[PDB]
Amino acid sequence: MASMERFLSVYDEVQAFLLDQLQSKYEIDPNRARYLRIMMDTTCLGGKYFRGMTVVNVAEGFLAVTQHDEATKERILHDACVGGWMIEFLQAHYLVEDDIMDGSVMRRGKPCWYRFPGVTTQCAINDGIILKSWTQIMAWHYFADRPFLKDLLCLFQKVDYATAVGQMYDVTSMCDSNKLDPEVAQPMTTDFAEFTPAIYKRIVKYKTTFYTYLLPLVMGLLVSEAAASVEMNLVERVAHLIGEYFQVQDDVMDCFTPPEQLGKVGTDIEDAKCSWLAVTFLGKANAAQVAEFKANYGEKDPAKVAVVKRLYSKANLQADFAAYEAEVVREVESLIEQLKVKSPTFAESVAVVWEKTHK
Amino acid sequence: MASMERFLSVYDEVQAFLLDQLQSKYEIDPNRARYLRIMMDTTCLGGKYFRGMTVVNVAEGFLAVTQHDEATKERILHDACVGGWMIEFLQAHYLVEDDIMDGSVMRRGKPCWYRFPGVTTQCAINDGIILKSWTQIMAWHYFADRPFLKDLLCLFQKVDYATAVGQMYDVTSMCDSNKLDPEVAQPMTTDFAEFTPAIYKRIVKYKTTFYTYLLPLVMGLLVSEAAASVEMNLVERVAHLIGEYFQVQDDVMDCFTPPEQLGKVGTDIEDAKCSWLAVTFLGKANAAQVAEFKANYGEKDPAKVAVVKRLYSKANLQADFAAYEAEVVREVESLIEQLKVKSPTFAESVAVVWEKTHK
Ligand SMILES: Cc1ccc(-c2noc(CNC(C)C)n2)cc1
Ligand SMILES: Cc1ccc(-c2noc(CNC(C)C)n2)cc1
Numbered sequence: 001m002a003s004m005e006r007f008l009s010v011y012d013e014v015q016a017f018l019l020d021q022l023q024s025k026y027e028i029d030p031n032r033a034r035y036l037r038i039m040m041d042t043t044c045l046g047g048k049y050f051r052g053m054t055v056v057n058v059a060e061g062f063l064a065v066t067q068h069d070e071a072t073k074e075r076i077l078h079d080a081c082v083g084g085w086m087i088e089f090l091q092a093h094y095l096v097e098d099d100i101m102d103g104s105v106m107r108r109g110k111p112c113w114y115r116f117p118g119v120t121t122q123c124a125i126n127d128g129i130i131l132k133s134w135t136q137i138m139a140w141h142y143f144a145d146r147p148f149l150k151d152l153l154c155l156f157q158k159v160d161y162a163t164a165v166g167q168m169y170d171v172t173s174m175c176d177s178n179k180l181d182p183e184v185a186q187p188m189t190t191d192f193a194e195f196t197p198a199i200y201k202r203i204v205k206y207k208t209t210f211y212t213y214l215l216p217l218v219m220g221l222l223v224s225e226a227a228a229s230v231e232m233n234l235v236e237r238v239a240h241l242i243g244e245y246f247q248v249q250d251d252v253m254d255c256f257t258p259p260e261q262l263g264k265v266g267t268d269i270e271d272a273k274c275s276w277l278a279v280t281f282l283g284k285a286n287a288a289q290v291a292e293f294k295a296n297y298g299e300k301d302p303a304k305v306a307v308v309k310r311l312y313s314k315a316n317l318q319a320d321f322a323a324y325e326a327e328v329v330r331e332v333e334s335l336i337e338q339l340k341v342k343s344p345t346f347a348e349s350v351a352v353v354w355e356k357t358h359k
Numbered sequence: 360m361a362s363m364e365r366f367l368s369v370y371d372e373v374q375a376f377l378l379d380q381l382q383s384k385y386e387i388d389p390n391r392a393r394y395l396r397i398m399m400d401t402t403c404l405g406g407k408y409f410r411g412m413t414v415v416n417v418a419e420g421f422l423a424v425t426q427h428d429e430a431t432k433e434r435i436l437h438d439a440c441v442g443g444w445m446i447e448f449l450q451a452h453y454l455v456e457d458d459i460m461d462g463s464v465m466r467r468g469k470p471c472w473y474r475f476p477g478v479t480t481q482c483a484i485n486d487g488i489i490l491k492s493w494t495q496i497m498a499w500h501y502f503a504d505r506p507f508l509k510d511l512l513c514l515f516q517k518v519d520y521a522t523a524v525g526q527m528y529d530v531t532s533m534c535d536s537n538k539l540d541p542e543v544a545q546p547m548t549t550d551f552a553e554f555t556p557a558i559y560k561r562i563v564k565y566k567t568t569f570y571t572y573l574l575p576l577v578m579g580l581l582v583s584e585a586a587a588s589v590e591m592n593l594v595e596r597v598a599h600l601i602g603e604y605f606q607v608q609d610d611v612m613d614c615f616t617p618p619e620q621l622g623k624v625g626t627d628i629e630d631a632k633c634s635w636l637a638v639t640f641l642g643k644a645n646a647a648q649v650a651e652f653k654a655n656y657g658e659k660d661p662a663k664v665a666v667v668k669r670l671y672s673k674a675n676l677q678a679d680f681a682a683y684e685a686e687v688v689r690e691v692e693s694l695i696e697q698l699k700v701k702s703p704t705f706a707e708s709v710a711v712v713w714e715k716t717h718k
């Protein structure tokens with residue numbers, strides 16, 4: 001059976017299971033069941049399933065090199081699908097809540113969930129909450145007597161928290177740390193002294209890399225009972241690296257990719273985002289350019305936003321990007337190499353992820 | 360050591376642990392640490408700790424009748440405190456998010472967390488997320504090799520989901536189920552055909568009773584390894600009952616308790632809440648009263664809200680309340696009785712909860 005076909009089938013099974021359990025154990029009525037079904041489809045379907053499918057692809061890899069009965073192969077593949085869906089639903093949770101937090105308009109060329117006329121922020125905050133509880137209902141039901149249950153839940157829990165800590169670093173990234181105070185409305189930074197590579201790297205690592213890269217790879221290993229074909233410090237380093245690279249590209253596209261293709265009008269300039277472009281720009285600008293940057297950044301006035309774009313184009317950031325890219329390629333290949341010692345299968349799955357990321 | 364003193368001490372220890380782990384493992388900086396410390400104190404302290412302290416009080420009960428070394432007594436009491444705090448933090452999560460959802464103004468005579476000038480909805484949604492992840496960080500750290508870890512996490516997870524399902528029943532309680540549709544803005548009900556005792560009881564059971572009553576009692580039993588001194592169906596029924604009673608009283612106070620004492624201006628009338636008062640009023644009104652109810656309910660126009668209050672006063676709802684109260688007292692005492700078979704200690708703790716609730 002092809003992997004996508006399995007993964008999509010498992011969605012319909014898990015949806016049926018969750019909705020049926022609401023009826024049999026939570027006294028739900030059909031109209032509310034239908035609301036949550038539509039919620040689930042609208043927030044969880046329609047992407048490329050990179051994160052979910054990685055869990056499946058990692059598991060498929062170990063299946064080729066490990067002796068198993070047929071029924072075990074199926075159980076492993078089914079576990080990989082459910083685990084994959086746990087990450088997609090985790091992602092959907094974060095996307096629903098982030099869009100509300102940020103006052104976002106569109107997501108995947110369609111309106112954000114909270115904007116749907118019969119949803120509203122009042123319901124959508126809680127719909128996002130339910131998405132994440134669904135990930136745990138899946139794990140407890142499907143993996144009830146799996147040996148990996150404890151480790152899986154512990155990992156998931158750590159990644160979730162990292163993500164939320166990351167979101168916090170992200171939403172406060174235009175503030176001066178020394179001014180943060182729940183009592184005092186927060187001004188945007190004037191100096192941009194916290195627009196550094198290290199500070200940037202901290203936001204992306206917590207906000208994105210743990211749930212996008214670390215979680216699917218390690219979940220793959222857990223459902224395959226293969227945590228011992230790898231050096232966990234290595235899997236960490238390579239994920240944080242591929243993950244960083246991922247965010248550099250979406251920081252670049254937020255700026256220089258028409259809103260048609262982005263599936264979203266970019267507002268990193270006007271949100272005064274600590275993006276790779278602003279940081280890298282500030283690491284190479286002369287004094288007159290830094291002053292012009294500061295006079296325009298974080299302003300919706302389209303004219304000021306077109307000034308920030310001008311400065312980035314002028315400053316030749318594509319050269320910095322290709323330099324970054326060359327170094328990331330170096331480091332990723334070296335890490336892949338170090339992964340091949342213990343597992344060529346796992347190293348090949350990390351190679352396949354990095355490819356999809358790069359292209 | 361007195362129980363409150365222990366419980367508050369354990370707060371300072373758990374706060375220190377969580378903040379220290381952010382620094383040592385999540386690369387946090389001191390100013391963000393201070394933000395989250397203030398967040399934690401402002402959202403989690405200041406209440407009566409009924410839910411948290413019940414876990415402690417249940418555990419104290421079994422300590423009197425069970426042979427244990429001193430070090431075990433302390434470990435059990437310490438576990439009860441941490442578990443208690445897991446419920447307070449769960450509650451804080453729900454209060455932070457509900458206040459945002461509902462556009463609430465005050466909570467405990469102080470502004471809702473999201474209203475604080477240096478917070479904003481953008482941060483407060485995520486602060487609420489962190490509150491709930493903190494409950495899991497506590498459990499995994501403090502209860503890492505406890506035999507009850509699995510059961511505790513499973514229970515907590517079920518209660519959390521129930522609560523979120525409950526919130527959903529609550530936020531959609533003024534809609535007609537047959538009209539719910541994420542595509543179509545939701546009108547308030549015209550007929551009030553879903554303002555029934557059964558429908559009311561469904562909202563309160565999911566929204567409140569699981570986290571407020573079931574969770575503290577069962578968590579008490581789990582940390583005491585005493586799940587076998589009770590009949591779990593009984594503990595369920597008595598909690599759902601005391602819990603329902605709880606909501607009937609706060610539905611009454613939302614209306615007839617000055618905002619000074621409530622710690623919050625009530626808006627159940629103008630939110631068109633399925634409260635006990637509206638339901639009970641509709642179960643006894645004549646046709647002219649139902650029509651007047653319908654012409655005023657769910658409207659901020661204070662004059663219309665004063666009409667709804669008039670109708671409730673006229674309709675003699677206090678008599679219905681005392682009738683309800685007499686029946687709840689009957690049923691609770693009968694359940695206590697059925698609990699005494701297996702455990703007089705547990706039955707006495709359920710007696711102590713019901714007292715605090717009643718008074
Ligand atoms: C585990 C994992 C996670 C994310 C990705 C990924 N995300 O976006 C892309 C493709 N973005 C190109 C088309 C610009 N690949 C791949 C693997
Ligand atoms: C386990 C648990 C949970 C809640 C309560 C409770 N809540 O509020 C009150 C007191 N409300 C009176 C002063 C009107 N008792 C008690 C025990």
Ligand SMILES: [Zn+2]
Nearest residue numbers: 098101102170
């Ligand atoms: Zn965001």
Ligand SMILES: [Zn+2]
Nearest residue numbers: 250251254268
């Ligand atoms: Zn972006």
Ligand SMILES: [Zn+2]
Nearest residue numbers: 457460461529
């Ligand atoms: Zn509410």
Ligand SMILES: [Zn+2]
Nearest residue numbers: 609610613627
């Ligand atoms: Zn209320």
